[PDB]
Amino acid sequence: PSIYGHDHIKKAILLMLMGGVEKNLENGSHLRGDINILMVGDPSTAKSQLLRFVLNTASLAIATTGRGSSGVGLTAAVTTDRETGERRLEAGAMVLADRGVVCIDEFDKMTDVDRVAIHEVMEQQTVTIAKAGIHTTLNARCSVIAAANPVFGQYDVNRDPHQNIALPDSLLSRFDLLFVVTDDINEIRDRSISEHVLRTHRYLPPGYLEGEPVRERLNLSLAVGEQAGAKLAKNKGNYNGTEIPKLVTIPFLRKYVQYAKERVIPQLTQEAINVIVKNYTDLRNDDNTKKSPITARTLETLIRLATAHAKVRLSKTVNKVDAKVAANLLRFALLGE
Amino acid sequence: RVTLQEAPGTVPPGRLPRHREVILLADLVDVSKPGEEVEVTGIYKNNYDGNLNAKNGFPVFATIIEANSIKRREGNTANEGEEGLDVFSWTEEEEREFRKISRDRGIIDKIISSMAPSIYGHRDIKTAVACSLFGGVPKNVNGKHSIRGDINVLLLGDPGTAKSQILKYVEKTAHRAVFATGQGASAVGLTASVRKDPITKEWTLEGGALVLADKGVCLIDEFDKMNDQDRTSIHEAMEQQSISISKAGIVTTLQARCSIIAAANPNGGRYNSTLPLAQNVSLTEPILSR
Amino acid sequence: VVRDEEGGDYTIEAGALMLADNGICCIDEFDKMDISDQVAIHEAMEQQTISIAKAGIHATLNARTSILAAANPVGGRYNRKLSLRGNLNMTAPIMSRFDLFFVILDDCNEKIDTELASHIVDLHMKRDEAIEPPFSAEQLRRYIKYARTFKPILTKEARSYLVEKYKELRKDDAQGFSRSSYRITVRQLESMIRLSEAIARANCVDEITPSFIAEAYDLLRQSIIRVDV
Amino acid sequence: GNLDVKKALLLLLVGGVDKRVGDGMKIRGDINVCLMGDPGVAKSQLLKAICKISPRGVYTTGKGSSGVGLTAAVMKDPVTDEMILEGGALVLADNGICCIDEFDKMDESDRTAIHEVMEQQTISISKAGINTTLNARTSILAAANPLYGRYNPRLSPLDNINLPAALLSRFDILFLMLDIPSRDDDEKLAEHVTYVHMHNKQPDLDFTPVEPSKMREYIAYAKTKRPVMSEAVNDYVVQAYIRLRQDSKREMDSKFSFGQATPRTLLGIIRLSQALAKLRLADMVDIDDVEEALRLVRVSKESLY
Amino acid sequence: SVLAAANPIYGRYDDLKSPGDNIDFQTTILSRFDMIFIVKDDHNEERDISIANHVINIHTGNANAMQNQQEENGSEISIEKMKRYITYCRLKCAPRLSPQAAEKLSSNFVTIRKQLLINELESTERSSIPITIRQLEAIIRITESLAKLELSPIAQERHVDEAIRLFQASTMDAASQDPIGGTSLSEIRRFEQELKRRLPIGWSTSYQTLRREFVDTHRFSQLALDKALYALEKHETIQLRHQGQNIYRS
Amino acid sequence: RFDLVYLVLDKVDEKNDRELAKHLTNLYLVLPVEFLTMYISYAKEHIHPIITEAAKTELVRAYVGMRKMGDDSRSDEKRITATTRQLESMIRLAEAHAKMKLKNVVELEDVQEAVRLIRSAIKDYATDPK
DNA sequence: AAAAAAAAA
Ligand SMILES: Nc1ncnc2c1ncn2[C@@H]1O[C@H](COP(=O)(O)OP(=O)(O)OP(=O)(O)O)[C@@H](O)[C@H]1O
Ligand SMILES: Nc1ncnc2c1ncn2[C@@H]1O[C@H](COP(=O)(O)OP(=O)(O)OP(=O)(O)O)[C@@H](O)[C@H]1O
Ligand SMILES: Nc1ncnc2c1ncn2[C@@H]1O[C@H](COP(=O)(O)OP(=O)(O)OP(=O)(O)O)[C@@H](O)[C@H]1O
Ligand SMILES: [Mg+2]
Ligand SMILES: [Mg+2]
């Protein structure tokens, strides 16, 4: 709630945390099931903060930076055991994050060589290690979110999108959604964001006075821990009243996503298929300038987003409204409003 | 105990050096320093060894040298004027003679004229070299302000002006002198370097060229051609008189009290008298002001 | 300087100049040297020493050598219109290092090439061992080793003639132009002294006659006659 | 869609003319075809399909794994560190089907390895006095893209593969897959993909009387028959080569300059006619096979535009 | 906290050169920093005399006495007492803002953002020193640090004004210094002829009348003010007095 | 510094392409044995031929002839194409020709063969001018 | 086996 704007970024994050279902076939091998989001923008536009929020609110996630990591040790390492005296593999950065989400900062500043590891993993969600007589395929079906800044200090709107991004096209084509953020100078928005940020910094922890700094505390009183339906104490979530629309607390949202990721596996119908194919054809043959080229992968992204939105409303079938909202989100992420 | 190799100046060209072991008893501890060429007078002795016999298969014995006298021979190769373990030590009568001859009128002129007696002219260069190798006084204000007390000298001019001969004489007469030249010196070679010890297997500090110049003079030839990355690593040595390293988990600061004397050549090989100094050399103000 | 990967060698390897100590180094094709050697040579030549300080090892190696080199003019053929500086690509400080220059040209004259081909053929088949030198190799080595054991000196008239010659050589070249001709330094006087001493050694005389000074001056002057022509 | 590439793969699975000629001159029955196309054309998916359906298929790439190129799999393997080694060898290079994605990615070592494997040449790289050469006889499958990732209106050899032209001339068939935005084709592609997704299975929209194991048996059956050549087509192939050299007379017209002169073009068309006699026909080589090979070459060049 | 020292390209700042190519740091790294000080050398011989006297006295023969008096008259405190005081203040106090201070901060941020937009629009290139929300957070932290000096639980206008002054110094010194970087100059000559022709030495005209006439002609308002203050900067024969109304020609 | 150089230029013509097509198709549808190797060994190590005085005149005449071509009716100082490398080329080639056929002294045919062989390569060394 | 510093291309 403390991040102003970035509405569709929040919507994409919500769809990503509880993405679509994985499809497997006896003849079609494997179909990717989750969604990846990449953000590029000029400095001080709240990308690292949103990434930290996603790290905090996710059920399972691993924090990683581009410069402080090495691709060889990021997937698997060979070390000797002190007791037995043999050598055994150690899980890497994203192997620990299997079925989770991996967040990487300074993505463009990472060494090019290590990027091949991502090229290995994001391709088929499986890393294969073959070194010192060890032959094993390790499963890693994680989703990766990255944030990188353009080559220049600030984004150039009048320049080619390709020359503004240091990353090669091969990896950029894999990411489903590309988001560009700029801090356009406008006195109205400057005043609004200024009063919002000043509101944020005037906050006091409950039950604690303002004259002394924040002090550490002890653990919970219990070493081990553990009327119905009439309370709605932490259900409604509107802890403080500042706007007419509702708001929900974080733990209930985590409970909601936990329930949704397990109890619901939706299926699609022909009504959404018609909208998907129609909007794909219209987007492909509009013949106007666009930020990124499209291909058959974008339609598969639309299908995965439609499945994710069929999951978000707790329904077993895909409604055409999900196709419409997915098309609108894609059109924003590729054209802009 | 210390390992003694062969001096590269006396080894046959293209061959390999020979190693021996030297043992230092009391009053000889820490006299020698790594990287410093020395001359040791000692006693040759032999002792039994087991593994050495095992590897060679013959009754071979190990040999060591126990030191009895050490004489430093770094830089000052001129070793014919006088004898002794050290040539920079004075007796009481020599102190008396110093005091007797230090009071006569116009001793500054005699000192200046007695330096490099085989070079004609260049009085200003001789005066500058004397003032640079005599040095000043470092200042410490309340233990909280530091003022450098050594003088740097830069030489510049046309070829065939015997700058290198002056540098050689300065190296000969100084107590602690180190000679570097052209591109043959790197940025990390002049300053301190970090190295992994092959035996104990952890990072350690290796004394650089400037560290050997403490209480002494560091001489550089062909200063202009030296690459900028190899030239920007001595700013602290000139001004701050300290070397700081933060590498491989080691955070230490090394003191360095050295005077830098450099020689170079202008653009085009000759000095254009009708142009300012800014258009004669490619050096900038941060290096020129020091 | 070479060191083993994670190895405690930190040893130096000797270049051709280092191996040629107390001898003659014969470098061929001087033109395509690189910057490091191109700036190390004019320190190795004049000061007869090489100094290095890299990666924690410092040393001053002895490089007492007598160098002889060959080169090819830029463009292939020597252009008689221009001078030595115009044709060669070497730097001005390197030229001052050398003590003598020899420029040799080929031509299309029919009288010379026939003699050259005949002499090549004769040595190839007819008289492959029957060449006619005035003295044998062993006699040459004996005389050279006998003459190397002499140290000539200089007399009063030799000094006066030498200073007069140096003054004349400094004056006449500086009369040409300013900021375009700069070729005579004290190194030229030292070269005259060395060449006179060598010529005195050749005749096995403990003293030096001004005729030797005149011959050395003639050599150094025709080194400048060539650059004019 | 993409019937041409599937037909080329089928003709590849049988193999060209082989087992030498008179006097011992070397001829290789393996066909070397390269696939050109922008990202997002499922050439990698088709490569995975052909690798899965071919028992001898192997997939490699530029680095990622180091013990795959220029070295065998038995390096420093035994507990005694006996250093068992053959020297210069590849992965199952004998009668194998090497498949590579991102054929512009690999470093100089693997590129030199391919330059060593050109035209069934043995691998003779030695390190410690070993000369146990591996008799490499394999077909080459290469999929790559121009480093710009898209086609350009300018001169087409400027894109090519960003690889030396000597390697390019080695290959038998070059096929280009250019993504052209069209409503009447992208509509069908989208409908087929979404119908595949809807059923969560292979759709009944397809109509194939043959099955993967069925053709797995039939490829071996057709390779067993092994027809031999016929003489009456020599004049036809000679005049075809003459008109190909006539085309080379116009290679300076440029903008699709790939129509260059090479005797390996004649060798490849002979091999493709042999394969077009091998795949279905009995011990007989027909002129229609030469005609079909010529049409395949023309269609392969046609995608340049 | 990071305290970094750096030198611009070409040694001295070389003010005649554009500010864009005197600093090689990217936009991203400069944003994290929030107090950028450009110390330039100057020559007027009075500050030079003062500095020479200061250094000459600070030579150890004299300073060893004078500084002692600074600890005897209570004008300064020793280093260790300052260390104890700073650790005590860091442990104890942690101030907080007030709504009036928040309003003043918001207004100041909007003002500086608009001024940056004006300078960018005139210059027609991206500014080498950016202004973002990080700068607003920086000013907030400066106000809080100023309030932390006196152990005040609440930060008020007295600290906010000084923090704003410090930020104004560190902004006008580096970011908004000579944004012009030195219609083109064809009008510049055309104006300067008119003032000499129509306005003799010693007389004066109102600013409003000159602006009116030159907006009536092709000159317009934007062109006039820039070279008006330029000719004032030249100060050879143009002087301002009596607020911004009297254009005196010296 | 090479002794010789050979250039191959495959250009599109009807006749040569037809001939290559026929020849390659016929191959697709008088040679000794290691005898060659032992003959070569015998020539290498038993045979040591020398040049005679008669061939010297022809060698000098050939050198002059390639010298005379190197200049023309203009004072432009045309390129010097007759180098001593050519001389070593012809002497070595003529001696090697006498090495073949197990002879002991050279004949004229050797020197004409050598000069023709070198000048055939030189005649194809010209650029677009001349 | 894997990380980090140095000289040469
Ligand atoms: N819309 C916003 N609402 C609240 N704070 C914001 C907003 N945009 C930026 N900020 C503030 O900008 C500051 C910069 O934070 P941060 O470095 O994480 O951002 P960023 O855009 O990811 O930067 P970078 O590209 O340098 O990593 C934060 O203190 C954050 O509070
Ligand atoms: N008064 C003098 N001034 C200059 N040179 C002199 C003088 N007296 C003698 N010489 C001779 O001049 C020569 C100059 O030596 P050298 O070539 O090393 O000098 P340099 O031009 O300073 O050198 P570098 O090439 O290192 O810049 C020496 O051989 C020296 O003997
Ligand atoms: N014609 C098509 N029919 C069906 N699926 C297709 C088609 N073209 C592309 N695809 C889709 O493309 C994906 C695989 O293609 P892929 O992107 O690997 O191709 P590529 O050209 O080799 O690209 P890259 O080098 O970027 O991997 C699959 O999800 C597949 O469904
Ligand atoms: Mg950030
Ligand atoms: Mg692919």
PDB file of C-alpha atoms in Angstrom, chain E residues 131-243:
ATOM      1  CA  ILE E 131      16.374  15.150  -8.966  1.00  0.00           C
ATOM      2  CA  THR E 132      14.114  12.300  -7.829  1.00  0.00           C
ATOM      3  CA  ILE E 133      12.193  11.104  -4.767  1.00  0.00           C
ATOM      4  CA  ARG E 134      15.531  10.057  -3.266  1.00  0.00           C
ATOM      5  CA  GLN E 135      16.321  13.766  -2.901  1.00  0.00           C
ATOM      6  CA  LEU E 136      13.083  14.342  -0.976  1.00  0.00           C
ATOM      7  CA  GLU E 137      13.985  11.455   1.330  1.00  0.00           C
ATOM      8  CA  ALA E 138      17.453  12.994   1.615  1.00  0.00           C
ATOM      9  CA  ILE E 139      16.093  16.363   2.721  1.00  0.00           C
ATOM     10  CA  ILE E 140      13.837  14.601   5.237  1.00  0.00           C
ATOM     11  CA  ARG E 141      16.848  12.755   6.651  1.00  0.00           C
ATOM     12  CA  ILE E 142      18.841  16.005   6.793  1.00  0.00           C
ATOM     13  CA  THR E 143      16.060  17.653   8.811  1.00  0.00           C
ATOM     14  CA  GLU E 144      15.913  14.669  11.163  1.00  0.00           C
ATOM     15  CA  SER E 145      19.700  14.665  11.603  1.00  0.00           C
ATOM     16  CA  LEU E 146      19.626  18.391  12.374  1.00  0.00           C
ATOM     17  CA  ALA E 147      16.914  17.834  14.987  1.00  0.00           C
ATOM     18  CA  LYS E 148      18.977  14.947  16.400  1.00  0.00           C
ATOM     19  CA  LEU E 149      21.744  17.379  17.410  1.00  0.00           C
ATOM     20  CA  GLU E 150      19.749  18.936  20.266  1.00  0.00           C
ATOM     21  CA  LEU E 151      18.021  15.676  21.318  1.00  0.00           C
ATOM     22  CA  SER E 152      14.657  17.175  20.354  1.00  0.00           C
ATOM     23  CA  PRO E 153      11.897  14.534  20.062  1.00  0.00           C
ATOM     24  CA  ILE E 154      10.177  16.605  17.345  1.00  0.00           C
ATOM     25  CA  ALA E 155      11.680  18.350  14.318  1.00  0.00           C
ATOM     26  CA  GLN E 156      10.387  21.843  13.578  1.00  0.00           C
ATOM     27  CA  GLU E 157      10.781  24.734  11.130  1.00  0.00           C
ATOM     28  CA  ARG E 158      14.033  25.945  12.712  1.00  0.00           C
ATOM     29  CA  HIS E 159      15.809  22.793  11.512  1.00  0.00           C
ATOM     30  CA  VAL E 160      13.900  22.499   8.228  1.00  0.00           C
ATOM     31  CA  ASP E 161      14.980  25.972   7.110  1.00  0.00           C
ATOM     32  CA  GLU E 162      18.664  25.204   7.690  1.00  0.00           C
ATOM     33  CA  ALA E 163      18.340  21.846   5.922  1.00  0.00           C
ATOM     34  CA  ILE E 164      16.668  23.576   2.969  1.00  0.00           C
ATOM     35  CA  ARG E 165      19.502  26.116   2.911  1.00  0.00           C
ATOM     36  CA  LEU E 166      22.085  23.319   2.819  1.00  0.00           C
ATOM     37  CA  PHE E 167      20.236  21.553   0.003  1.00  0.00           C
ATOM     38  CA  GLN E 168      19.930  24.837  -1.906  1.00  0.00           C
ATOM     39  CA  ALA E 169      23.686  25.319  -1.609  1.00  0.00           C
ATOM     40  CA  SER E 170      24.471  21.762  -2.736  1.00  0.00           C
ATOM     41  CA  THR E 171      21.980  22.081  -5.628  1.00  0.00           C
ATOM     42  CA  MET E 172      22.750  25.560  -6.980  1.00  0.00           C
ATOM     43  CA  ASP E 173      26.472  24.798  -6.729  1.00  0.00           C
ATOM     44  CA  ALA E 174      26.401  21.642  -8.882  1.00  0.00           C
ATOM     45  CA  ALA E 175      23.146  20.886 -10.718  1.00  0.00           C
ATOM     46  CA  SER E 176      21.741  24.306 -11.658  1.00  0.00           C
ATOM     47  CA  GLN E 177      25.122  25.990 -12.203  1.00  0.00           C
ATOM     48  CA  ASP E 178      25.338  27.557 -15.687  1.00  0.00           C
ATOM     49  CA  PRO E 179      22.620  25.317 -17.205  1.00  0.00           C
ATOM     50  CA  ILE E 180      22.922  27.238 -20.484  1.00  0.00           C
ATOM     51  CA  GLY E 181      26.505  26.007 -20.879  1.00  0.00           C
ATOM     52  CA  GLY E 182      27.705  29.267 -22.410  1.00  0.00           C
ATOM     53  CA  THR E 183      17.750  31.947 -32.843  1.00  0.00           C
ATOM     54  CA  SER E 184      21.451  31.470 -31.996  1.00  0.00           C
ATOM     55  CA  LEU E 185      23.681  34.549 -31.585  1.00  0.00           C
ATOM     56  CA  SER E 186      22.423  36.483 -34.625  1.00  0.00           C
ATOM     57  CA  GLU E 187      19.869  38.215 -32.404  1.00  0.00           C
ATOM     58  CA  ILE E 188      22.504  38.653 -29.673  1.00  0.00           C
ATOM     59  CA  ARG E 189      24.442  41.037 -31.907  1.00  0.00           C
ATOM     60  CA  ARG E 190      21.181  42.623 -33.097  1.00  0.00           C
ATOM     61  CA  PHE E 191      20.059  43.484 -29.555  1.00  0.00           C
ATOM     62  CA  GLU E 192      23.411  44.860 -28.420  1.00  0.00           C
ATOM     63  CA  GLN E 193      23.450  47.362 -31.286  1.00  0.00           C
ATOM     64  CA  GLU E 194      20.010  48.685 -30.317  1.00  0.00           C
ATOM     65  CA  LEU E 195      20.920  49.429 -26.693  1.00  0.00           C
ATOM     66  CA  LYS E 196      24.022  51.373 -27.732  1.00  0.00           C
ATOM     67  CA  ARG E 197      22.093  53.192 -30.466  1.00  0.00           C
ATOM     68  CA  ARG E 198      19.033  54.113 -28.395  1.00  0.00           C
ATOM     69  CA  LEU E 199      20.369  54.271 -24.805  1.00  0.00           C
ATOM     70  CA  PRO E 200      23.434  56.482 -24.222  1.00  0.00           C
ATOM     71  CA  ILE E 201      25.882  56.338 -21.324  1.00  0.00           C
ATOM     72  CA  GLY E 202      24.514  57.680 -18.046  1.00  0.00           C
ATOM     73  CA  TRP E 203      20.813  57.543 -18.917  1.00  0.00           C
ATOM     74  CA  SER E 204      18.341  54.793 -18.048  1.00  0.00           C
ATOM     75  CA  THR E 205      15.060  53.237 -19.147  1.00  0.00           C
ATOM     76  CA  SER E 206      12.369  51.210 -17.432  1.00  0.00           C
ATOM     77  CA  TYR E 207      12.454  47.431 -17.745  1.00  0.00           C
ATOM     78  CA  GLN E 208       8.767  47.299 -18.685  1.00  0.00           C
ATOM     79  CA  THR E 209       9.129  49.653 -21.662  1.00  0.00           C
ATOM     80  CA  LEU E 210      12.095  47.777 -23.149  1.00  0.00           C
ATOM     81  CA  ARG E 211      10.322  44.449 -22.648  1.00  0.00           C
ATOM     82  CA  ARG E 212       7.159  45.855 -24.248  1.00  0.00           C
ATOM     83  CA  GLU E 213       8.937  47.183 -27.333  1.00  0.00           C
ATOM     84  CA  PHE E 214      11.058  44.076 -27.848  1.00  0.00           C
ATOM     85  CA  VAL E 215       8.078  41.747 -27.462  1.00  0.00           C
ATOM     86  CA  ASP E 216       6.293  43.976 -29.980  1.00  0.00           C
ATOM     87  CA  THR E 217       9.162  43.287 -32.377  1.00  0.00           C
ATOM     88  CA  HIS E 218      10.554  39.828 -33.227  1.00  0.00           C
ATOM     89  CA  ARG E 219      12.687  39.730 -30.062  1.00  0.00           C
ATOM     90  CA  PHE E 220       9.964  38.424 -27.688  1.00  0.00           C
ATOM     91  CA  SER E 221      10.283  38.137 -23.903  1.00  0.00           C
ATOM     92  CA  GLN E 222      12.401  34.987 -23.535  1.00  0.00           C
ATOM     93  CA  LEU E 223      15.316  36.294 -25.611  1.00  0.00           C
ATOM     94  CA  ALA E 224      15.529  39.631 -23.779  1.00  0.00           C
ATOM     95  CA  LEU E 225      15.956  38.463 -20.174  1.00  0.00           C
ATOM     96  CA  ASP E 226      18.815  36.034 -20.847  1.00  0.00           C
ATOM     97  CA  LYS E 227      21.125  38.539 -22.485  1.00  0.00           C
ATOM     98  CA  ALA E 228      19.879  41.286 -20.166  1.00  0.00           C
ATOM     99  CA  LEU E 229      21.360  39.358 -17.250  1.00  0.00           C
ATOM    100  CA  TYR E 230      24.334  38.444 -19.464  1.00  0.00           C
ATOM    101  CA  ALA E 231      25.170  42.100 -20.152  1.00  0.00           C
ATOM    102  CA  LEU E 232      24.659  42.685 -16.439  1.00  0.00           C
ATOM    103  CA  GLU E 233      27.114  39.841 -15.805  1.00  0.00           C
ATOM    104  CA  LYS E 234      29.549  41.477 -18.230  1.00  0.00           C
ATOM    105  CA  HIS E 235      29.109  44.567 -16.015  1.00  0.00           C
ATOM    106  CA  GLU E 236      31.190  46.663 -18.413  1.00  0.00           C
ATOM    107  CA  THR E 237      28.510  49.305 -18.989  1.00  0.00           C
ATOM    108  CA  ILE E 238      25.202  47.904 -17.624  1.00  0.00           C
ATOM    109  CA  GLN E 239      24.135  48.238 -13.974  1.00  0.00           C
ATOM    110  CA  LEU E 240      20.999  47.367 -11.996  1.00  0.00           C
ATOM    111  CA  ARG E 241      19.750  49.590  -9.195  1.00  0.00           C
ATOM    112  CA  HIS E 242      16.447  50.350  -7.463  1.00  0.00           C
ATOM    113  CA  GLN E 243      15.033  46.807  -7.624  1.00  0.00           C
TER     114      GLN E 243
END
